[PDB]
């Protein structure tokens, strides 16, 4: 299963926050999703189809070593504080998820 780090990230309101999801993929058929616990999908890699007039503060990018992914949130808000994880979606052959351990985000005033 993918790993998700750091286990605790503390940032200030308005700042950027970046977790790293490391997933050793055996193929290009996978979808790497970023979730928040109530799970709610925030973003994916590859990114879902774009829609005009719809912008997102959450992004998943693949680093050049191919194993690591950055899960970035911009303009962090107080209510973004919570529990997050990433999961890899693939065919089992049935649809299957492999979830990372959970990590915590804390967004503080100022």
């Amino acid at each position, epitope marked *: 299963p993918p790993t998700f780090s750091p286990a605790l990230l503390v940032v200030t309101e308005g700042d950027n926050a970046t977790f790293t999801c490391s997933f050793s993929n*055996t193929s290009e*058929s996978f979808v790497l*999703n970023w979730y928040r616990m109530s*799970t709610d*999908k925030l973003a994916a890699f590859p990114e879902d189809r774009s829609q005009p007039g719809q912008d997102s503060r959450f992004r998943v990018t693949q680093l050049p070593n191919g194993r690591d992914f950055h899960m970035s949130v911009v303009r962090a808000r107080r209510n973004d504080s919570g529990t997050y994880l990433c999961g890899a979606i693939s065919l089992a*052959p049935k*649809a299957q998820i492999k979830e990372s351990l959970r990590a915590e985000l804390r967004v503080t005033e100022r």
Partner: antibody
Amino acid sequence: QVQLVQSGAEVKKPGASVKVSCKASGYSFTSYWMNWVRQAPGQGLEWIGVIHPSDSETWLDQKFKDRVTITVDKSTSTAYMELSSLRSEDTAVYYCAREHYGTSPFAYWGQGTLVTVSS
Amino acid sequence: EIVLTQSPATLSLSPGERATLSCRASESVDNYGMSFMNWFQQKPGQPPKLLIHAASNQGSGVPSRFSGSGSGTDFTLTISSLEPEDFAVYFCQQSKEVPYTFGGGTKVEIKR
């Protein structure tokens, strides 16, 4: 480019077996599930089964569990589907199809192999 | 098995018109915050070609006019402006569970 090239059309008598090839190229063969699907003339699409070429893990639709064998030869990047005890109702175009985008089992297709079963 | 029901059986439209195709599943396609529904186009003598996966995302090189929507048990394929090369049969297919299953198809034919 991902390419899946199947063997040619076959005409078979009832009771016979047919072994269809799918030659894969343009990607790493052992990293993606390979599916088999058939379509009867003017008819809709029916999944037969799937194999993962890395370890030959195989899942078959219950309808075909006792007449179908799906195999791979890693040395030639070729997948095979062998259908036994052929019946008139097996006349169909048989397709191999490769997964992609981590949820789509059917994302790349071979050109199809017509198998006509007749006396 | 998850049974897929497509409607209407046939759509009779002109180039430039909007085509809206429906696919209903006998139980939910969804898992992990996603929808496991795929759409294909098929012309005579050819294999199907994937247009949509995870039932709004596009396959490679699929024109902008093809879009997918829906969740749970109700899905839609939209072609916002028909081109002559779009008159085809279209299939939906789910990947949430095996056996993988297909709808019966919707033929988009030329109105005259």
